[PDB]
């Protein structure tokens, strides 16, 4: 089960893993599946290929991933991002995140403002931040 999926994909991608920058390696694999979703369009059908993608990417760049096994050291980090990572908003990430999972139900409404869950995440995040500093 786990070995058949690993050894099969490892032997094919090993040549382009050690040489290619893991930042470009992910970006290509991501833009491709994004266009595989626009050709096919089932959402549970689409969770199946992505979830089998998540497991292999973990085998590859996760702890002890074939990458960390090939190269020692390596703090992690597949890309350093300037300005854009500092300028990306959580509220915008949530709305896009909700666009894929909400689907039907409460409409997006105006920018800012949250559903019940968004507020629970935002406050739990804001609460755990001010208490840990104590």
């Amino acid at each position: 089960i786990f070995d058949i999926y690993y050894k099969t994909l490892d032997a094919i991608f090993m040549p382009i893993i050690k040489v290619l920058h893991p930042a470009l390696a992910i970006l290509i694999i991501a833009i491709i599946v994004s266009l595989i979703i626009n050709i096919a369009t089932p959402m549970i059908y689409t969770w199946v290929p992505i979830i089998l993608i998540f497991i292999y990417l973990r085998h590859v760049y996760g702890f002890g991933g074939v990458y960390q096994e090939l190269n020692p050291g390596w703090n992690g980090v597949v890309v350093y991002l300037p300005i854009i990572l500092s300028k990306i908003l959580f509220i915008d990430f949530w709305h896009w995140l909700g666009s894929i999972f909400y689907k039907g139900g409460f409409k997006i409404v105006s920018n800012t403002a949250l559903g019940w869950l968004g507020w629970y995440i935002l406050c739990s995040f804001a609460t755990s931040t001010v208490l840990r500093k104590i």
Partner: antibody
Framework: EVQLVESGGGLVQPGGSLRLSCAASGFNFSSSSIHWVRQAPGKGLEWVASISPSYGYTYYADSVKGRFTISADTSKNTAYLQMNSLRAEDTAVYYC?????????????????????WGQGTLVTVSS | DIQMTQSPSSLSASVGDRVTITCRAS??????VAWYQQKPGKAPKLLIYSASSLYSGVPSRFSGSRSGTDFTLTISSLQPEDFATYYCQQSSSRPVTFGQGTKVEIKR
């Protein structure tokens, strides 16, 4: 307005240990790779170890492998070279060198292409 | 392991002459090779990288070339400040390896 300052050289008994530091200034330490290259007295250049801060890759030579540990502190803007089980043949001047970087790095990491800037090095003598 | 055999070991030229140094790789390597100039008691400096790319500040009097596995450094018109030992490095594979060195001297 760039430079690298090695330090920590001196006489050491065989089987001891010494620790060299490379203080860099004038360029981006987080990006450019750092390299250690030693030159035995009267001989040519020899490659000891290379490291890439940020990504944290470590590259050692079969000569110093196991006795030498290279590291870099991004917050201090310095690259350290730890030397254990020093032997008589390791005596030489130790140059700290910055790798030279081309945009092809972005597509491919791990490519040296050369050394751009070399510190004047620090002398290390191992003898009783 | 890769070895780089550089020749000749030493040579005596004169001002205005044309010097040629050859660095032969042991096996197939990329076009990424560097040529270094080292004055006596000084740190090595970079002249040519990628075999053919001239490094900034280095006068056009210097130049590299790639013939198969034989990389070559060429000083068109030798100058008084160009006298020193020259090394050739292959950075296309690990471990990195340098050349034995070429010692250039004036003739009088």
């Amino acid at each position: 307005e760039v430079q690298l300052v090695e330090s920590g050289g001196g006489l050491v008994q065989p089987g001891g240990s010494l620790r060299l530091s490379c203080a860099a200034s004038g360029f981006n330490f987080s990006s450019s790779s750092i390299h250690w290259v030693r030159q035995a007295p009267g001989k040519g250049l020899e490659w000891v170890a290379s490291i890439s801060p940020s990504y944290g890759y470590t590259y050692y030579a079969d000569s110093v492998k196991g006795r030498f540990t290279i590291s870099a502190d991004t917050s201090k803007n310095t690259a350290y070279l730890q030397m254990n089980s020093l032997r008589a043949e390791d005596t030489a001047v130790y140059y700290c060198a910055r790798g030279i970087w081309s945009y092809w790095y972005m597509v491919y990491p791990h490519d040296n292409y050369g050394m751009d800037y070399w510190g004047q090095g620090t002398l290390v003598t191992v003898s009783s | 392991d890769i070895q780089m055999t550089q020749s000749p070991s030493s040579l005596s030229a004169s001002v205005g002459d044309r010097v040629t140094i050859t660095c032969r790789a042991s096996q197939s390597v990329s076009s990424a090779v560097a040529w270094y100039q080292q004055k006596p008691g000084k740190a090595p400096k970079l002249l040519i990288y990628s075999a053919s790319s001239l490094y900034s500040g280095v006068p056009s009097r210097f130049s590299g070339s790639r013939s198969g596995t034989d990389f070559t450094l060429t000083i068109s018109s030798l100058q008084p400040e160009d006298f020193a030992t020259y090394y050739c490095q292959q950075s296309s594979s690990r471990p990195v390896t340098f050349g034995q060195g070429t010692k250039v001297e004036i003739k009088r």
